[PDB]
Amino acid sequence: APKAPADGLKMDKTKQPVVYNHSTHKAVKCGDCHHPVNGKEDYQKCATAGCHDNMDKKDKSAKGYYHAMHDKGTKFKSCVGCHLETAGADAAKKKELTGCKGSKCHS
Ligand code: HEM
Numbered sequence: 001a002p003k004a005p006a007d008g009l010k011m012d013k014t015k016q017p018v019v020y021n022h023s024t025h026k027a028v029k030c031g032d033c034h035h036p037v038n039g040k041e042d043y044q045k046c047a048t049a050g051c052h053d054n055m056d057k058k059d060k061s062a063k064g065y066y067h068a069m070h071d072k073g074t075k076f077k078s079c080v081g082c083h084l085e086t087a088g089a090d091a092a093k094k095k096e097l098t099g100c101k102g103s104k105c106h107s
């Protein structure tokens with residue numbers, strides 16, 4: 001089976017890079033993120049060609065990289081989508097986990 005990589009992974013396809021730590025996400029199944037494609041959980045980098053390789057941040061297709069990290073109502077919960085549920089009504093946690101600046105994702 002695939003193993004989780006080290007913490008401190010930098011996602012840097014964009015000018016707003018974000019650090020991702022697997023160890024704070026163990027309660028999420030691997031395949032909620034590394035989701036099935038053609039019936040098999042896909043562990044490739046998310047922006048692999050043919051995957052979320054569209055770097056236009058307004059795109060909402062299955063190729064839109066920004067969309068896959070930020071939007072709600074997606075087939076798999078996005079970073080922000082899941083964090084909004086986690087924070088609930090707690091405004092401090094909303095800032096920490098979902099804020100567009102000054103959050104744990106974006107400075
Ligand atoms: C569950 C224990 C789990 C595994 C296994 C796993 C593996 C994994 C690998 C091998 C990579 C590196 C991919 C590469 O070749 O560079 C990787 C990277 C990311 N992961 Fe992961 N991962 C597991 C769990 C989770 C969970 C639960 C999430 C979502 C909350 C998640 C997300 C990511 C992200 C984002 C990356 C970086 C990918 C990129 O920038 O393209 N993983 N993981």
Ligand code: HEM
Nearest residue numbers: 033034037042044045046050051062068074075076077078
């Ligand atoms: C990398 C860890 C990674 C993330 C993160 C990710 C997210 C993601 C979301 C949030 C969706 C739903 C979007 C919606 O509008 O419903 C989604 C959908 C698909 N993805 Fe993805 N995805 C990651 C990785 C990969 C990889 C490595 C590929 C290409 C092999 C890929 C492709 C797709 C496709 C196709 C979809 C649509 C799937 C379907 O509708 O069943 N993703 N992804």
Ligand code: HEM
Nearest residue numbers: 018019020021024025028032077078079082083086104105
């Ligand atoms: C998507 C790639 C994604 C990112 C980026 C992300 C980041 C992130 C940070 C920076 C934290 C704070 C802890 C740390 O520094 O590692 C954090 C915490 C939680 N997350 Fe997350 N997260 C991403 C994706 C997801 C997804 C898809 C879910 C749920 C399905 C999820 C959940 C959580 C939870 C729960 C935490 C802990 C909350 C707390 O208050 O610290 N994340 N994430």
Ligand code: HEM
Nearest residue numbers: 011012013014016017018057069079080097098099100105
């Ligand atoms: C708040 C809703 C919010 C906004 C707005 C926002 C913006 C943003 C931009 C402009 C980028 C770069 C897009 C581009 O292609 O130029 C970007 C990138 C990432 N973000 Fe973000 N972001 C907002 C909030 C959050 C939060 C709270 C997280 C983490 C849960 C998060 C995550 C990400 C990720 C991952 C990326 C991609 C990093 C990379 O590969 O460079 N965003 N965001």
